[PDB]
Amino acid sequence: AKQSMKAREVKRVALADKYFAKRAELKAIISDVNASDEDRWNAVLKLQTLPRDSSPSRQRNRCRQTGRPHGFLRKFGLSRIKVREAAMRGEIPGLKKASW
Amino acid sequence: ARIAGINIPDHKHAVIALTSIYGVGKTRSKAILAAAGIAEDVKISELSEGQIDTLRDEVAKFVVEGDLRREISMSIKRLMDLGCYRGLRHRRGLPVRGQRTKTNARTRKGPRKP
Amino acid sequence: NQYYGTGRRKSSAARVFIKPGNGKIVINQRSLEQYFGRETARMVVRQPLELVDMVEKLDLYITVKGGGISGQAGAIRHGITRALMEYDESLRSELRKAGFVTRDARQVERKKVGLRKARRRPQFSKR
Amino acid sequence: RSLKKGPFIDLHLLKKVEKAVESGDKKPLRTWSRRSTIFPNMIGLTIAVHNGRQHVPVFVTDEMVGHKLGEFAPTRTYR
Amino acid sequence: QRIRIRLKAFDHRLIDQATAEIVETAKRTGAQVRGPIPLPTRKERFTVLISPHVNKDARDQYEIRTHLRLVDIVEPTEKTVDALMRLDLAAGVDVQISL
Amino acid sequence: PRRRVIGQRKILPDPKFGSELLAKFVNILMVDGKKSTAESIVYSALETLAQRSGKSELEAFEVALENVRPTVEVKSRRVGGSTYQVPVEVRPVRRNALAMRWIVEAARKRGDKSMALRLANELSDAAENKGTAVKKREDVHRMAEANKAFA
RNA sequence: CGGUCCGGCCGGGAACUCAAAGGAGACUGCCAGUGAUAAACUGGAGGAAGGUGGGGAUGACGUCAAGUCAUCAUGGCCCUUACGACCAGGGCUACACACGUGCUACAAUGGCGCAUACAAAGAGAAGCGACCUCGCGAGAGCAAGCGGACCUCAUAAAGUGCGUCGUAGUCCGGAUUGGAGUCUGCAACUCGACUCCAUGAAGUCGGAAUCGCUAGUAAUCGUGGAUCAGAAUGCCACGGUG
């Protein structure tokens, strides 16, 4: 995709590692827990005040090369197009064409 | 014999026949015929007149017929008059629960016009 | 003495021991009648004991994994008939002619990219 | 529906409403919070909720409480 | 003690050189070796669309086979732990070692 | 097919009777690969048959079947516009297939309760020859004799 | 073979299934006949398999200025206080209509209720999540195990047996709408899925026309996966019956 849209998926990873991965993983338990406090949550109102792109929900996967949003494959971190280009040169190990 | 709703079921089985009330399905049924202590296979003819007036009291717990028809109609009217989304969909005859209208809303729109 | 056969059909794989002496059919520690609740599946495990003789002549203890009913049946059929040819030998002539010796090669055809199943194409439209 | 551990509102709406209840009723609030459950303490006010271009005046009745704010600004024109 | 070695690797000729080293290396330095028993073989499968834009029935089905081998050693000498630790194999083999 | 002249598959005989011709009848009656429940229906409606037409269970079938079996059919054939129904003398094997198939399309059409009723009553009426499966065989023997000209 | 809490569970066994490496096997090789003594063909034997045994992968020179500058690359043209860049809300989900591809139906070869059997192939650490406890249910609480032939997802369903419904727009059908919930998620109004109670449309096998299939095929029955916080009637794969 664009250079802007690849820059946006560094910005959204930068946050969600810093914040939610520690600090919102506290507050999602304080908003959960029924057998401790049912009045001084405060935390639901505090979860908004965190920057919005701290949520991992907001992260799309791109193909770590061309930046393409659709056609992703998690094992390889790549679009279906670049998987195949790389497969056939022999750059993905053990991967061959199948038949059965 | 007629039930606490101003209705008259048939000579089927009983759990089925109580479904014939507006406001009673198959779950309420089996729920009623139980508390009253009737077997559910048993018919309406082959049921004594103490065993029918126990049912009249049981179905008087639940909101049924012109209690219910009103209760629905009044709830729909809150939406229509208040002018929320769901009101605006009720009053145009379009589907309310987010279904597509480009094709297929044919229950909710009626047979079709050129 | 224990006379052995393997047999297979579809995903089923039966293993079949033949003892001398009597009528009796075991199959995953159940009666033949308990295990197969369909008449069609019964008179294919017995089939080979008809061309070759049994009323009360050999017991058989068998076990079977995988497939479903009529798969498991056919594996056992073939499993017996391997084990008969272990024991007697010169029954092959008669068994071959009914063709219970032929391991049945038919697997399910795989499903194929483009198609709804193995061969079922989607509905074509010219225009 | 938001399960019964929470109902939801934006802080920037909550605190702007606490003001114009406490101080006294006024020219209407301009929110973009369409996603925010109308509470009991909002009744009487005019809130002007964003439909996607125009903010649209909504006089908050008693009967509205529980519904979301976005339900009273429609987004799409139609005839 | 039981130590057991799960070898796994994408190439089936590369793995059973690395096995046959380890079965030799243990027997020579005084031990009773078990296996090398073949476990089953995770074959993954990826279908992919093959054109850059459209043509949904044009596809290319790839696989990765992962071969897997297990070698139990029942009698360790003090040499036999260090003889196998010091060993170095090809790059495409992954060794493990439980205790 | 053009080149590909071919053999054909050994069906198993029927487990109760040993009747190879009756196995073909459960196949013809089977739907959705449920041979189980075809056999239930057939074995039933031969009990209901053979009881009510003086016994023999193989041969209450084979009297009802012998009645619907055809002997000629048409075979439409273009010459240069108008289309000539030619009578043609039907094979030994295809006699049964057509018979069996017509019995069942007749049985599947009636308005009795079970299928094992419906079948039993269109094997009753075959053997005392009325009902739709022989009204089919008669309106095929019309077409062969009406177009006897053309052979 | 011994012993048993009747469980391959525990001594043990290395036979059998299975696992995945290495080999053998099928070549018109052998027999007869047909044929220009040819190539081959028709039949037979033995064989697990017989005449390319079944399935895939493998797509000649070229054809349509076919498709894709929005995966990527790229010649030229163009914009450069905007056609670039950041944000919140909306939209891509609109609905008088027309077409395509699917799913569910219209029912006794069936529907509902109670018991009961037989698969394969997969996935799993910001993950799969047992047991036990709470909830009508979706789920919740607690918490072993498992980077996994070990543990979890995970009870296959058609089937079978026993009961019941009686040809009725019905105990067929589930659309739609009301009420109340559950979960994921900063957030389910626009616009998620799933549960419970209620509601119970059309539909009684479809005009002209038209599609798929030659065998483990069609038909029918469930199972898994990728994408994915959540969102499969689609897609890719797996076995059952047949």
From Swiss-Prot, chain A:
GO terms for cellular component: cytoplasm; cytosolic small ribosomal subunit; small ribosomal subunit. One of its GO terms (molecular function) is rRNA binding. GO terms for biological process: cytoplasmic translation; ribosomal small subunit assembly; translation. InterPro entries: Ribosomal_uS14, Ribosomal_uS14_bac/plastid, Ribosomal_uS14_CS. PROSITE patterns: RIBOSOMAL_S14. Keywords: Ribonucleoprotein, Ribosomal protein. It holds the Pfam family Ribosomal_S14. Binds 16S rRNA, required for the assembly of 30S particles and may also be responsible for determining the conformation of the 16S rRNA at the A site. Belongs to the universal ribosomal protein uS14 family. Part of the 30S ribosomal subunit. Contacts proteins S3 and S10. PANTHER family: 30S RIBOSOMAL PROTEIN S14 (PTHR19836), SMALL RIBOSOMAL SUBUNIT PROTEIN US14M (PTHR19836:SF19). This is Small ribosomal subunit protein uS14.
Swiss-Prot record, chain B:
Keywords: Ribonucleoprotein, Ribosomal protein, RNA-binding, rRNA-binding, tRNA-binding. It comes from the Bacteria. Residues 93-114 are annotated as: Disordered. The keyword Heme does not apply. The keyword RNA-binding applies. GO terms for cellular component: cytoplasm; cytosol; cytosolic small ribosomal subunit; small ribosomal subunit. InterPro entries: Rbsml_uS13_C, Ribosomal_uS13, Ribosomal_uS13-like_H2TH, Ribosomal_uS13_bac-type, Ribosomal_uS13_CS. PANTHER family: 30S RIBOSOMAL PROTEIN S13/40S RIBOSOMAL PROTEIN S18, SMALL RIBOSOMAL SUBUNIT PROTEIN US13M. This is Small ribosomal subunit protein uS13. One of its GO terms (molecular function) is rRNA binding. GO terms for biological process: cytoplasmic translation. Belongs to the universal ribosomal protein uS13 family. It comes from Escherichia coli (strain K12). Part of the 30S ribosomal subunit. Forms a loose heterodimer with protein S19. Cross-links to the P site tRNA and weakly to the A site tRNA. Forms two bridges to the 50S subunit in the 70S ribosome, contacting the 16S rRNA and proteins S19 and L5. Located at the top of the head of the 30S subunit, it contacts several helices of the 16S rRNA.
Curated annotation (Swiss-Prot), chain D:
PROSITE patterns: RIBOSOMAL_S19 (PS00323). GO terms for molecular function: rRNA binding; structural constituent of ribosome; tRNA binding. It holds the Pfam family Ribosomal_S19. One of its GO terms (cellular component) is cytoplasm. Keywords: Ribonucleoprotein, Ribosomal protein, RNA-binding, rRNA-binding, tRNA-binding. In the E.coli 70S ribosome in the initiation state it has been modeled to contact the 23S rRNA of the 50S subunit forming part of bridge B1a; this bridge is broken in the model with bound EF-G. The 23S rRNA contact site in bridge B1a is modeled to differ in different ribosomal states, contacting alternately S13 or S19. In the 3.5 angstroms resolved ribosome structures the contacts between L5, S13 and S19 bridge B1b are different, confirming the dynamic nature of this interaction. Bridge B1a is not visible in the crystallized ribosomes due to 23S rRNA disorder. InterPro entries: Ribosomal_uS19 (IPR002222), Ribosomal_uS19_bac-type (IPR005732), Ribosomal_uS19_CS (IPR020934), Ribosomal_uS19_SF (IPR023575). Belongs to the universal ribosomal protein uS19 family. This is Small ribosomal subunit protein uS19. Disulfide bonds: none annotated. SUPFAM superfamilies: Ribosomal protein S19.
UniProtKB/Swiss-Prot annotation, chain E:
NCBIfam families: PRK00596.1, rpsJ_bact. Belongs to the universal ribosomal protein uS10 family. It comes from the Bacteria. The gene is rpsJ. Involved in the binding of tRNA to the ribosomes. Part of the processive rRNA transcription and antitermination complex (rrnTAC). The complex forms an RNA-chaperone ring around the RNA exit tunnel of RNA polymerase (RNAP). It supports rapid transcription and antitermination of rRNA operons, cotranscriptional rRNA folding, and annealing of distal rRNA regions to allow correct ribosome biogenesis. In complex with NusB is involved in the regulation of ribosomal RNA (rRNA) biosynthesis by transcriptional antitermination. GO terms for biological process: cytoplasmic translation; regulation of DNA-templated transcription elongation; ribosome biogenesis; transcription antitermination. It comes from Escherichia coli (strain K12). Gene3D superfamilies: Ribosomal protein S10 domain. This is Small ribosomal subunit protein uS10. GO terms for molecular function: structural constituent of ribosome; transcription antitermination factor activity, RNA binding; tRNA binding. PANTHER family: 30S RIBOSOMAL PROTEIN S10 FAMILY MEMBER.
